[PDB]
Amino acid sequence: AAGEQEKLEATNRYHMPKETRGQPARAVDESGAPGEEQRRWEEARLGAASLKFGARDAASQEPKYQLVLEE
Amino acid sequence: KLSEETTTSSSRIFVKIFFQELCEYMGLPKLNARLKDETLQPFFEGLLPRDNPRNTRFAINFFTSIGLGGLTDELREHLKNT
Amino acid sequence: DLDRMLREQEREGDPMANFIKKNKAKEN
Amino acid sequence: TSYEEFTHKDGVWNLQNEVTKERTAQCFLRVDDESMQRFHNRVRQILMASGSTTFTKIVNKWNTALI
Amino acid sequence: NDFLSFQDIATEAAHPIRLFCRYIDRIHIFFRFTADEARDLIQRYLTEHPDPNNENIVGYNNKKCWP
Amino acid sequence: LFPPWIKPADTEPPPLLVYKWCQGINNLQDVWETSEGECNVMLESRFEKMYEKIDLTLLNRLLRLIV
Amino acid sequence: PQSDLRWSKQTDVGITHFRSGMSHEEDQLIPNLYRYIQPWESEFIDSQRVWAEYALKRQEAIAQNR
Amino acid sequence: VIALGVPNPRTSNEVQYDQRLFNQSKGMDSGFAGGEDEIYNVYDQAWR
Numbered sequence: 408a409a410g411e412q413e414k415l416e417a418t419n420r421y422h423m424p425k426e427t428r429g430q431p432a433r434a435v436d437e438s439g440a441p442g443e444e445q446r447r448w449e450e451a452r453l454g455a456a457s458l459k460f461g462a463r464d465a466a467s468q469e470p471k472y473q474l475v476l477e478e
Numbered sequence: 479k480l481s482e483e484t485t486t487s488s489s490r491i492f493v494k495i496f497f498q499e500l501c502e503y504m505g506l507p508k509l510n511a512r513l514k515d516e517t518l519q520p521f522f523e524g525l526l527p528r529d530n531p532r533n534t535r536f537a538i539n540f541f542t543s544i545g546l547g548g549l550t551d552e553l554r555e556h557l558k559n560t
Numbered sequence: 561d562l563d564r565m566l567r568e569q570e571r572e573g574d575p576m577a578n579f580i581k582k583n584k585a586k587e588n
Numbered sequence: 589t590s591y592e593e594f595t596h597k598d599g600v601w602n603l604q605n606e607v608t609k610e611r612t613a614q615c616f617l618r619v620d621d622e623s624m625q626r627f628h629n630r631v632r633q634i635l636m637a638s639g640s641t642t643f644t645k646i647v648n649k650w651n652t653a654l655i
Numbered sequence: 656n657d658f659l660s661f662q663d664i665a666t667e668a669a670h671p672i673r674l675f676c677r678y679i680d681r682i683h684i685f686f687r688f689t690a691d692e693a694r695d696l697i698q699r700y701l702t703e704h705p706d707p708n709n710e711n712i713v714g715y716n717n718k719k720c721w722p
Numbered sequence: 723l724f725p726p727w728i729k730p731a732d733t734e735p736p737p738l739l740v741y742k743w744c745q746g747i748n749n750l751q752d753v754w755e756t757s758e759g760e761c762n763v764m765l766e767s768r769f770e771k772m773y774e775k776i777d778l779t780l781l782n783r784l785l786r787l788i789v
Numbered sequence: 790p791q792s793d794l795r796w797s798k799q800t801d802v803g804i805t806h807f808r809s810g811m812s813h814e815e816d817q818l819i820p821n822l823y824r825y826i827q828p829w830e831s832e833f834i835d836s837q838r839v840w841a842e843y844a845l846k847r848q849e850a851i852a853q854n855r
Numbered sequence: 856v857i858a859l860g861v862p863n864p865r866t867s868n869e870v871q872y873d874q875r876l877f878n879q880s881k882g883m884d885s886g887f888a889g890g891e892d893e894i895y896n897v898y899d900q901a902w903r
Contacts, residue, residue, distance in 0.1 A: 423787055446869050449847075455733040456840040458742060458833070461606045461749035462661045468607065472547040474539045474582050475557065477532075482576070491573050503593075503602065503611050543578040545609075598828055601741065603748040613754070615744045618720055634892075645893035652892040654822070658726045658733075659746030667751060674746055678729045678739075680769045685747060690759030722800050737829050850870050 479524040480537045494544050506548050513549060528556055589614075627653065723788065 479485065480493070501509055513522060527533045534557055538550040570577075593614060594600060601615035630653045638646055659674060661667045671692060674685035688696070729739060747753065753762065790804040813819060849855075858864065888894065 426786075442869060449870075453840065453844060456836065457844075458738075458745075458837060459606070459657070460659065460742070460745040462664055462667060462751075464663055465607050470547060472542045472550075474542055474579070474586075475535050475554070476539070476583060476586055477535065487569055487572070487574065487576065490575055491569070494573050494575060502604065502609055505610055506608075539579060540575050543575045543582070598830075601744060601830055603744055606745075606749045613748050621720065641893070648895050649892040651897050655897065656726065658731075659742060664751050673750055674743070675727050676729055676739075676743065677727060678736075680772050682765070682767045682769065683743070684763075684765045686763040686765070687750070687753065688761045688763065693759070693761055722798055738833065741829065741833055847870055851868075854867070855871075 480527065480540060481533050482536055490540070497541075497544060497546065501546055506546070510549055514552070526553060528553065531557055531560065 485493075504512075512518075513526070525537075527537055534553060538553050538557065541547070541550045593602075593611070599617050601617065602611040603613040603615055604610065605612045631650075634646065634649045634653065637649075641649075656662065658676075667673065671686045671688050672684060673687045674683075676683045730736065734742065752760075791806040791808050792802050792804060796802045886896065
């Protein structure tokens with residue numbers, strides 16, 4: 408998996424396209440197709456719906472009071 | 479009257495929404511200064527018990543589990559001394 | 561829909577359920 | 589802000605801090621004058637196109653622009 | 656990142672340009688400056704464009720819809 | 723390809739864009755503190771004749787980087 | 790709503806008077822359209838609460854397989 | 856044959872829903888046919 412990860416990060420580069428003479432050829436393409444488009448579009452609606460402001464680091468300046476409960 | 483024996487579940491929902499909006503639109507130091515005055519101390523004794531410490535523990539855990547904190551620091555001090 | 565409304569109020573904001581969850585977290 | 593906050597009808601967006609969950613600022617809202625001119629020119633376009641239009645369709649054009 | 660968030664507070668405060676948005680061709684930029692950076696920027700602008708008679712108020716424009 | 727500052731995105735209506743911009747201003751770190759001469763600057767503008775000055779050879783060279 | 794035009798351009802001075810909008814027969818009370826449109830701030834608050842509740846319900850339905 | 860001829864099943868992802876909440880609204884496009892000012896449609900349901 409580490410060797411495959413090295414080849415995968417070698418694949419994911421920019422590589423701006425060569426001007427090719429003639430008709431184009433289909434290169435190497437995917438994701439989970441059967442049944443995952445519903446939860447994918449639910450994730451799209453959740454990303455369009457969720458609103459949160461400020462930076463992600465906001466856990467500072469929290470006293471974090473705990474419950475006393477009972478003994 | 480903050481007590482689990484008397485108040486129904488919808489009453490706790492109502493008090494939670496009410497005090498969340500009170501902590502929102504005016505500040506928690508200002509809310510503590512409003513609740514900490516000597517003139518309105520008989521008017522807050524059903525809300526802030528300081529007696530029968532099962533009920534005081536319930537009030538402290540209630541205001542903590544709402545998400546406030548802060549207001550029950552005096553009640554935590556009073557509970558820790560007894 | 562009163563039964564679904566009591567189901568929604570038992571699934572509401574509910575500090576009692578938070579007490580139950582934190583008590584089972586602290587006990588176990 | 590002097591005195592206190594200005595509890596006014598609906599033009600005020602009470603902006604909330606994400607951390608402290610407190611209303612820290614107020615956003616007064618007004619409609620820009622370009623939008624005023626666009627709406628007024630829409631009504632003027634309706635009135636100039638009213639010469640060959642029935643009453644129901646004129647009211648429908650007004651209702652569309654108004655909502 | 657999302658629209659108006661950063662990874663860190665230190666990534667926010669590393670530059671004067673805090674917020675940026677482009678609506679097709681409209682541009683909305685929000686800067687935050689300290690005293691020294693604002694003084695240096697004012698000094699460089701007055702170095703290129705001097706104005707001893709304080710005529711910069713006259714060409715400046717303001718929102719007339721507000722009181 | 724498009725970073726999230728490019729608007730109008732499909733995620734929000736433009737009043738929600740206004741509200742998100744106001745909240746992103748409000749939720750910055752120490753944004754209203756002016757004790758040490760810190761100044762906030764909000765700039766709004768346009769690009770004027772943006773559409774009329776897109777050179778087509780440069781546009782073809784730029785679009786060959788993408789597609 | 791109407792106030793002094795002397796102090797309209799200076800500050801906001803509240804509302805001291807009302808003038809009529811359109812003529813109608815005494816009482817009438819024609820309903821305004823703006824009272825049937827929710828304000829944007831209430832819709833944003835309700836949208837945040839409803840979508841957070843839906844996200845927690847979806848997490849519970851995934852975890853409990855219900 | 857995994858379900859019947861094997862007694863060992865597998866887990867399932869995603870969320871199950873009621874079908875009755877599933878297809879209330881149809882249509883490809885928005886309810887504003889371009890501009891289309893004079894086509895009434897200010898209300899969703901019928902009057903009575």
